[PDB]
Amino acid sequence: LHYAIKHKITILPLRPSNYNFKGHLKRFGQYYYSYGTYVISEQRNIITITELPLRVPTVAYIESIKKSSNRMTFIEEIID
DNA sequence: TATATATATATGTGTATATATACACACATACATATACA
Numbered sequence: 001l002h003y004a005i006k007h008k009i010t011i012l013p014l015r016p017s018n019y020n021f022k023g024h025l026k027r028f029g030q031y032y033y034s035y036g037t038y039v040i041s042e043q044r045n046i047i048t049i050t051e052l053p054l055r056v057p058t059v060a061y062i063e064s065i066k067k068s069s070n071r072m073t074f075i076e077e078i079i080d
Numbered sequence: 081t082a083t084a085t086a087t088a089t090a091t092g093t094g095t096a097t098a099t100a101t102a103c104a105c106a107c108a109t110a111c112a113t114a115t116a117c118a
Contacts, residue, residue, distance in 0.1 A: 067109075 023051045 004011050016025055016032055023036045037051035052061060062080065065071060 064108080 021051075021054060023053060 001011060018025060021034075023034055026033050026035065034053040036049065036053050036056075039048040039050055040046075041048075052058065058080070062078065066078070
């Protein structure tokens, strides 16, 4: 690590903090992405969202999904 | 001109809340302006 400080290279990893976060993180190319968790059931046409991505407010997400009429043509009722 | 309304203001010490602007940038939503056509 002293050699790496002298010559500006990396040895030890440095990952993002997933503490208190129940989705999952993936490194694609030059950036990380954060993923939330759904749960599907075709017997009732229900998807159950159980996790949002990092630092996403809940009511802002729900009001953002209601303004896209491209998505409103496929869903009927949304309950928190 | 008279007897009679019903709404209206201001004082101190209290109880509750509202709203405009700057600054950067990744991201989302709305056309619309053409360009092959058709």
